[model samples]
Target: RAAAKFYQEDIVQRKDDSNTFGVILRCWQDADPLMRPLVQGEVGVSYFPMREIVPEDTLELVDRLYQPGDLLKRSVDDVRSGVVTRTHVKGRLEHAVSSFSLPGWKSMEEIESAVEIDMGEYVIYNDWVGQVVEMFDESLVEVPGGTLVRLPLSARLAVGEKGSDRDTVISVKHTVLAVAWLAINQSLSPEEAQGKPRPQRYWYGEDLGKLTTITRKAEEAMRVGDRVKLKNTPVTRIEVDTLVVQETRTSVDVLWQDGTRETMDVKQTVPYLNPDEYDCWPGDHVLWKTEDHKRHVVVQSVNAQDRTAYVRVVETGAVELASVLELDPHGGLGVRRGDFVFIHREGTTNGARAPMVPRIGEVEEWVREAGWRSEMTELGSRIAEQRGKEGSVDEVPLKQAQKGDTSLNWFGEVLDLRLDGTIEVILPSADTIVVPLERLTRLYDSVEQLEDPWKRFEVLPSAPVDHAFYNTPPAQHTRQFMARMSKEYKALQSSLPDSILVRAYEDRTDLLRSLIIGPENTPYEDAPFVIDWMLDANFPQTPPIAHFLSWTNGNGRVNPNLYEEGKVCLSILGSESWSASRSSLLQALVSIQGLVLVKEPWFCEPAYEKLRGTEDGIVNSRLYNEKAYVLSRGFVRRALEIPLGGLEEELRWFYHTSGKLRKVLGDARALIVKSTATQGDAEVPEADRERAVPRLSSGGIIALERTLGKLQALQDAQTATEA
Candidate 1:
């Protein structure tokens, strides 16, 4: 196999710098000091000078030429030969040397007759050993918990499985479908969900396709006005987002991400969706909680800078401005299957520390649980419950997070999130347990300070719950309703009294989140109670619904007429009680300020006014006044510290423009100091005893302490500006 051949580029000789190509005999020999390189002219073989010849040795010449056992020098894309071996060409290559899966140029007849060498066999590329046809780089493949990542196209993936985390080699032969199968599992990334093609049915008839259908439904749901972007753009990169414009049928007209106003085919673009941007997108159908039935409206346009939307009521052809806080977004009522969340199940778990504290956990195990599998009509879960037969595998060992006994806190992932608002969790200590969605809280886009669930009391972005109730005959959001709403705002602006302020969002005239400021004589003096009014679509024809967002922070009913849990016992807001033709929101708020926050709120109760001069009335009303006065102080402190949603700036103006809270804090501290000594004893109403005897509840002292610190911080900032 080491025979000779005439090839180019062998001669390098001395001088006048003229060089000639060489004819060399390449063979293994025992010639010592007699090896030679011969150059030839046109006629005959010539003796090349051993000293003057710029020549290569026999072994060196063999290094340059392709031989039977020598390494081949070719780029990763070149191939005409096969691997060197005894029997046959180990493997035939395509047009490209390493990347071989293409229509090859070398004929099959030519490749078949390369009987000179080994056909071909496995050898490594840059990173991996495979038939030269295989990819050498990493690929997108499966990970635990329905996750995917790019890893090397390896022989065996070393990953932990079944919780033991031993070094296990998962072979690639079976992983082709096994890795691809996760798409039909819960691994539907936002990028992969809106695809037109489908999967999951082609393989071993998958376990009850419940999540398969949920995933398919989600893909089918990406509709008009959902955010779209350039097909390949990832969220980390900033491509100027197209002005997702006017909706057409399957196609939509869009404006400049860099200005192409043509109707672009939607199939070419990808949708923008995530857990946080749920049903708030424009053109999404949002639930409008009207009186009895669930009313839905299209979110026509959005100005998300202020987090507001103009919802279009198709039935009445009216567009109403709605706060993001005011409506239920899509899937707003419950948690999704793959979400990571917190459960606020109350019972004693681990020492005297109550279970009101939420435990954080992930939620992918829920997607493939027994309950999720049993939901299919093929395997029923309902009949097995009553008959007590083991027809389903749904029964799991569960320990109730019991009352007053310390239960060990075990961190676990969720195993089930049934459609009926309950969850099954897989805990290490308590095999697997059930917790309903009674106080289940979810956190999104978590940052460090915002995520300390136990450390601070933070107001959630999604209001805990908000739906207004009142004496209104819920009707369609007609043009007349909007007209009356606009008219009410105009009149309220002109005639609102100084003690009452009705504030309306300039974009939303339908809802007036108004507040009532009490006079100095009343128990609620200087403490503004928030009345967030949702004027029903049927304006004037129905009384407005008001939710009291102010009375909070572990306080009982401060005034009986103003119930703590958002109930305002106003006849003007009762069922069929007010004259819709004559009544206005202005009077409702006026009576709320004047009548509800009265000097003696006790007398407002039925038949209680008769005891005005009686011994029972003086003692009972005076006692009520003592408790009410202390509660009002706490409310004032709460307003200064936390404040309502819109009250931050309003209260800031109150202290800055008028310095009203400055004097209010001084009296609040002096009386509460006396109450701390008397242990909450309010003495007789004689003018002499009033100097030292006005008292408060034990909670009132702590309220003033924190409130004064908050006030002093503002005062210090003000003094700095003055200086």
Candidate 2:
């Protein structure tokens, strides 16, 4: 039933090159249609054997190529008519100069014996030190390698060569040398080894001593209010203030001195020093463009003859020219628009000339004209005279207040004084309340009398300040609730530094809002998880109504104890788990973090234990993990990326905390990789598919990945600046 197969010539040396040889074999194929006929004087089909196979080991080679089921015979008509073009043939060996004569070649048995040497032990081969990871084979040694160098082998014999007759032998020698070269440098192959570039005792630059004596200082920490230089040509410098808003693995978000924010790379910054030390050229730091005011700028250049300074605005990089009047004594615009200024205005509280005191205001605009100070002083005098006269308020018609007005009232700050004698005030609730010029009072000079005017107003509940519970009336036991909440708030604040952000309402003390950054090494890490709670009228006799406010767009639940409807299922919040003597809000929060949002949360389900170690349980748990990771990313977008109104400061606090942004972004990237790998053609039950599958939508995953990239960039910038 089997066709006979046999080697033709055991070894055929090239006619012109004795160093190279070919092993030819023939077989009979009656059924293979793809097989082609061999022409006159041509060898049969061939296949290169793996390097481990030896040419002398004929039995091993025969066992592999001439299997028991191989065809033994074929029809002559089939081969002639080309129904089956040719006989099926397999078996090949290309012989070269024997390893016996090669410098580093060893026998198969000898190479196998070398495996006895311990892994990681250094061995010398061809004068190169190589650690023995594994014994490759007789003609090859695996050495730690670098980039490949493609070298050509000549197909001509060196010693004995005649033109036409030597061609084949030259080709054979070329083939042999090529194979030999490959065999010697096998480690240089493209396939990368596992655990590559292995752990070593030293690195190239490790032996060098420290380069600089300068060490990073606490005050030098790249944060808001620090100055820095960029590592580039035409040196750039920027002053950081306001907020170092966000961070990713490679960049940071910083508010420039001119009140604009931008994301920049870490390497863009260098140690802060006097900008003057560097040439006053483009990208150098300086203040320009306003009267007696200063803001950061990147000097474009100075035109001494024209008395004009061309510069790029530091915050925005907009090019503009500074005229003669704009420049200060230092030959640059020493002042800039948007710089904070304090104007001295004389005022009377009780019909008497009040002491002239400085009132803070930002420089809104600037003009480069001579006698500008005298012009402004004269204008101020006229306004003051008009304000001092009685009956000024009645002269102007009363303007109806706009809805959500920002005008100041008796309990608000003085915004502006209109020429018509009306004063604008911003009420405690941020509503504009207009007041007559005659009724406006000068701010107290004494510190004791300078209490905040808005302090007495009832605080209004709003989003980010008891968002859901706003407009809800206070409970009968509000005072008691407030007292306890105050204590707990203080305790939390004092004990957990930089852990949580609490924003308790001043007017509605019973309503409390907080954001908890997911702890490191937990499923919720880096995510800003929000919580809102309202105390009941029954006081300590009942637990506060609490909700988990962070929600994904699809309303996916983030934790086992947190539900889609914003319900938090902590026992401490329920009647069954409530205790008048021992229960507290802080304890409930701690319990939620430790018990519900854990790294391995699958075991939270009661039935999970029964199914543990089984395929069903594993699949379900993995699915849950994927969904949870997706929801966590959503939490970051909702609570941190685009924080709720009035909660920007609190959200920024979360960003400032140690490793908060880094951990969350790192987890998100890892989750994306894991989720994608596990999301093969997995089938889900119809009942659970709606909840489980919908949470892993492509749009949401992509958006999450994009957001993670942004965060990573921010962190990177921060790390670089700090480093």
Q: Compare the candidates by TM-score and give the number of the best one.
A: 1
lDDT of 1 by residue, 116-184 (tens): 101111111111111111111222334443334334332222121232232221211111111112111
Q: Please report, in order, the local distance difference test score of every candidate based on alpha carbons.
A: 0.40, 0.38
Deviation in angstroms for 608 in model 2? Answer: 4.4
Tens-digit lDDT track of model 2 for 373-457: 4543443344334544764321121121223432112223444322232345544334654544323333321121223211111
Let me know the TM-score candidate 1 reaches against the reference structure. Answer: 0.33
TM-score of each: 0.33, 0.31
Candidate 2 Cα outliers beyond 4 Å, as residue runs? 1-466, 478-483, 490-498, 605-616, 656-663, 670-703, 706-723
The reply for model 1, stretches above 4 Å from the true place, is 1-476, 607-609, 642-648, 673-685, 688-693, 697-723
Best by lDDT: 1
